[PDB]
Amino acid sequence: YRQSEATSSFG
Numbered sequence: 001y002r003q004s005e006a007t008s009s010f011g
Contacts, residue, residue, distance in 0.1 A: 002009075 001011075
């Protein structure tokens with residue numbers, strides 16, 4: 001998990 005507001009991946 002990435003702390004940054006993940007983009008495209010959206011988890």
